[PDB]
Design a protein around this nucleic acid. Structure first.
Ligand SMILES: [Mg+2]
Ligand SMILES: [Mg+2]
Ligand SMILES: [Mg+2]
Ligand SMILES: [Mg+2]
Ligand SMILES: [Mg+2]
Ligand SMILES: [Mg+2]
Ligand SMILES: [Mg+2]
Ligand SMILES: [Mg+2]
Ligand SMILES: [Mg+2]
Ligand SMILES: [Mg+2]
Ligand SMILES: [Mg+2]
Ligand SMILES: [Mg+2]
Ligand SMILES: [Mg+2]
Ligand SMILES: [Mg+2]
Ligand SMILES: [Mg+2]
Ligand SMILES: [Mg+2]
Ligand SMILES: [Mg+2]
Ligand SMILES: [Mg+2]
Ligand SMILES: [Mg+2]
Ligand SMILES: [Mg+2]
Lengths: 95, 325, 154, 52
RNA sequence: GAGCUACCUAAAAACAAUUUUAUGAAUCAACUCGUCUAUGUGGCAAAAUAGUGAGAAGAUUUUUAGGUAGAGGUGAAAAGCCU
RNA sequence: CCGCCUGUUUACCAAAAACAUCACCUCUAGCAUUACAAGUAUUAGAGGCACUGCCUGCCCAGUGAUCACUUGUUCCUAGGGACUAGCAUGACGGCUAAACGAGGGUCCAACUGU
RNA sequence: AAUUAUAUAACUUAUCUAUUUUAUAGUAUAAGUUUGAAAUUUCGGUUGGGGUGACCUCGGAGAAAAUCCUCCGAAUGAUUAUAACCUAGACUUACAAGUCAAAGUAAAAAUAUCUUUGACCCAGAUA
């Protein structure tokens, strides 16, 4: 997402009121474009055996592209939500 | 919309080509290209130290080699190496003067004799003075320049090189008055006098855009140059004592500004004032300096020097005139 | 046959990346205003042009177009681009200072007939100095060094 | 040509004043009044400011 | 705002007599245009009238309906024309 | 004299020597479902320019002569190789050419209240 | 001419997909670079009207306190044993800027002579 910032100051409006804007308050400068940020990883718990990643019940940190396109869409994995973690850990312990 | 330099080039092509015939291409190329400088030691503090340093660089004094009070170091034949900039000496004077070696010919061939007095009619900053001051072992001297700022420029040069004690002697006096008017003031005063009339400065004229004699406004000034040159030469001829020597020097190549100027001075001197000037041959001088200088003997009067790429030290024209009475 | 000569002189034409080939062609078209047929002629005649980087080919062409007053056809006919810039400047500048060469005027006329381009470049230096310029070999060597100093100062 | 240079007090104080010297001669050094110490002390050239 | 004018689309229409031939040929009406002179100049007319002139089977002329719109359109280029 | 010719133009001060025009020349483009075009290099678009014949036509690498050297352009180190034999100039003038014109001039005859 | 220019045309780097064992393909977008279809804005003064020339600030000399009157020079340089702080009273002057200086205090054992540029804003440098 593109994030912008005013060049010109906007005077304070008050507590319940809204500022009145002028045509000079429509000039912006770009502070950041989020698409260029370093990428993160996605946490998932495997539900079925898969090559080179794991077998079952093991949390895996994967690239967002792979996790959203292959594992979750095909049903091989589930979100590492607190509830999903709790169910899988109990099954592992009993096993 | 021709620039000043283009006008200078156009005028030279039409005339110099005819005068010099097949040599014009050789002369033309050697002007537009780089010039060669010759280092002249200051004697004084730099008599020994710098001369050894320059020799270690293989730069060789042509005057010293020819003799085999003036020593000027020059590079080998066809050597393009430059000279390092002048450096400040321990004693408080500048190490050496870098100038066009050919510019020193009028001094070398002036036949200096001890116990004399000399005048520089028009030497604005010229080393022709500073070099003379080195030659002026036993000579009172005087300097005159038409301009004001250029006169002060000379005095600054004198400070850097000439030690004060010598300057304190009356040998160094600064004046700025019209040369022709100066003739009336001091008639038959000095044995030897050097008159360097303002010339076309062809080398500078092409190179320098500013204050070029070939500008449209200065056309009248350019046209009248020969007449003014004659007036200055005649005034010096009167000023020199009976039996004195004078030398007429110019930077230009024009036949009009070299032979006609001197012939008019001799003719004007010959008739009106009942005086005779007899020229002194420099042919032997020509042969001695063959190695380091390039020239052609066609000119009836004077020893004109031309620029050659092998030895790019031209152009210098200098004629010697001795007043017999 | 055109491919045969190109392959022999410039074996890397196939290896070169797309970007490199396009820039050489684009310079010849947009900046040099060469026609479609001439472009094929130049590539076949002097394959080494492809190796040469841009911003040097453009300078070489403009040197002839403006300073030397040559035309598009003359450049193609004589294989001007084949020669090195150092040779062009060393010889042309020497003649110009001597007064033996003149840039054509606005009208397109020259007071003196200019020397043929083949005599300037194609012939050997010894013949070029002896015949085209009628100069001395030593003078040219001095001039080359003097020109080198000027470029260094530039 | 001449160059403007900054002479710095060698008293341990930072006091300085600007002087002129020709670029041909050597670096300058001088005696001058130092207000903070209230004595005459040496000032030695440390930096070049501009060319005039 | 293209009912005037510029160019285009669709559907229609007119061209006698004479000589040549077999045609952007010829003489000359209808019809289209507007060379030259006089009258007129708040005129019959905000560009006309009277004579005299150019073309007249063709790149001809004419009717009906539709299209292109102003930072634009149209132009056998007069910086012409678009109430 | 100018323009090849029939045509066109400043509605309301210019109809012409200007614009267009057959002819000739340069440049750009290898392709489909709304123009070009239901088309494809003898095609399409953009631009210049009278036609016709007639003199003037020269940047092929030089000399030997399909052959050897000398050049040139490149590399590998002043030596050593590689390449240049699958091609081969051009730039003006005087021309007009009969016809044609409400074009701009000169002249003879006739004619007349100019 | 100055200022811009996701008109087009190219590239490059990311982003998103494919593959590939790093790798070449592409690309509903963002950031750069290259071209420039266009867009907004302007046309110093005195010299008859032109045409070439010039000239516009400060100082010196003549006319003598006028001039488009007659001339020369300046946008520094050299030497300096290094020239502080504080403060009566004055010159010059539309404003702005520019000159000279007693007493007191302080360093030393008092002034460097030659003799001529540029406001404010806004950016610097170091301590
Ligand atoms: Mg209609
Ligand atoms: Mg109608
Ligand atoms: Mg009929
Ligand atoms: Mg009409
Ligand atoms: Mg007719
Ligand atoms: Mg008719
Ligand atoms: Mg007809
Ligand atoms: Mg027109
Ligand atoms: Mg007009
Ligand atoms: Mg209207
Ligand atoms: Mg016609
Ligand atoms: Mg007609
Ligand atoms: Mg029409
Ligand atoms: Mg009209
Ligand atoms: Mg007509
Ligand atoms: Mg009319
Ligand atoms: Mg026409
Ligand atoms: Mg007509
Ligand atoms: Mg008659
Ligand atoms: Mg006091």
């Amino acid at each position: 997402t593109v994030i912008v910032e005013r060049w010109w100051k906007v005077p304070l409006a008050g507590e319940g009121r809204k500022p009145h804007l002028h045509r000079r308050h429509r000039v912006y400068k770009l502070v950041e474009d989020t698409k260029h940020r370093p990428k993160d990883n996605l946490e998932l718990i495997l539900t079925q055996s898969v090559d080179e990643i794991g077998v079952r019940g093991d949390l895996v940190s994967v690239k967002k592209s792979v996790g959203r396109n292959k594992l979750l869409s095909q049903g091989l994995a589930v979100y590492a939500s607190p509830e999903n973690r709790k169910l899988f850990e109990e099954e592992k312990s009993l096993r | 919309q021709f620039t000043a330099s283009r006008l200078a080039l156009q005028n030279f092509d039409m005339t110099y080509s005819v005068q010099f015939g097949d040599l014009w291409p050789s002369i033309r190329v050697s002007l537009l290209s780089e010039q060669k400088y010759g280092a002249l030691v200051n004697n004084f503090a730099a008599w020994d130290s710098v001369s050894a340093k320059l020799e270690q660089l293989s730069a060789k004094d042509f005057v010293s080699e020819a003799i085999s009070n003036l020593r000027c170091f020059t590079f080998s034949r066809g050597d393009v190496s430059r000279f390092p900039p002048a450096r400040l000496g321990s004693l408080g004077l500048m190490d050496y003067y870098l100038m066009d070696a050919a510019s020193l010919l009028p001094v070398l061939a002036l036949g200096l004799q001890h116990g004399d007095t000399v005048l520089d009619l028009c030497a604005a900053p010229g080393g022709k003075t500073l070099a003379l001051l080195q030659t002026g072992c036993c000579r009172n001297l005087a300097a005159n320049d038409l301009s004001t700022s250029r006169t002060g420029r000379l005095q600054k040069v004198l400070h850097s090189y000439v030690p004060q004690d010598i300057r304190e002697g009356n040998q160094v006096r600064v004046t700025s008055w019209d040369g022709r008017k100066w003739g009336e003031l001091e008639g038959d005063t000095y044995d030897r006098v050097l008159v360097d009339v303002p010339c076309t400065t062809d080398r500078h004229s092409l190179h320098e855009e500013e204050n070029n004699i070939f500008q449209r406004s200065r056309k009248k000034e350019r046209q009248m140059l020969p007449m003014l040159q004659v007036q200055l030469l005649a005034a010096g001829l009167l000023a020199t004592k009976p039996g004195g020597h004078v030398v007429y020097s110019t930077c230009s190549l024009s036949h009009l500004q070299n032979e006609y100027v001197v012939q008019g001075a001799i003719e004007l001197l010959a008739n009106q004032y009942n005086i005779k000037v007899q020229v002194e041959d420099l042919s032997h001088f020509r042969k001695l300096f063959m190695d380091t200088f390039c020239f052609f003997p066609s000119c009836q009067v004077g020893e004109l020097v031309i620029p050659n790429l092998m030895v790019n030290f031209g152009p210098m024209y200098f004629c010697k005139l001795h007043r017999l009475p | 046959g055109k491919l045969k000569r190109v392959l022999s002189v410039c074996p890397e034409v196939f290896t070169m990346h797309q970007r490199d080939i396009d820039r050489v062609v684009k310079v010849l078209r947009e900046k040099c205003l060469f026609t479609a047929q001439h472009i094929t002629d130049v590539l076949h005649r002097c394959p080494t042009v492809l190796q040469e980087d841009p911003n040097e080919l453009e300078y070489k062409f403009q040197y002839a177009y403006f300073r030397m007053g040559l035309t598009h056809l003359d450049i193609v006919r004589t294989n001007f681009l084949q020669y090195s810039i150092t040779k062009i400047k060393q010889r042309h500048i020497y003649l110009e200072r001597l007064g033996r060469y003149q840039t054509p005027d606005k009208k397109g006329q020259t007071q003196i007939p200019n020397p043929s381009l083949r005599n300037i470049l194609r012939v050997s230096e010894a013949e070029f100095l002896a015949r085209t310029a009628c100069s001395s070999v030593e003078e040219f060597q001095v001039f080359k060094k003097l020109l080198d100093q000027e470029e260094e100062e530039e | 040509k001449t160059i403007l240079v900054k002479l710095v007090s060698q008293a341990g104080t930072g006091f300085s004043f600007n002087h002129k010297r020709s670029r041909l001669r050597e670096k300058l050094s001088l005696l001058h009044y130092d207000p903070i110490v209230n004595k005459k002390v040496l000032f030695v050239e440390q930096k070049k400011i501009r060319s005039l």
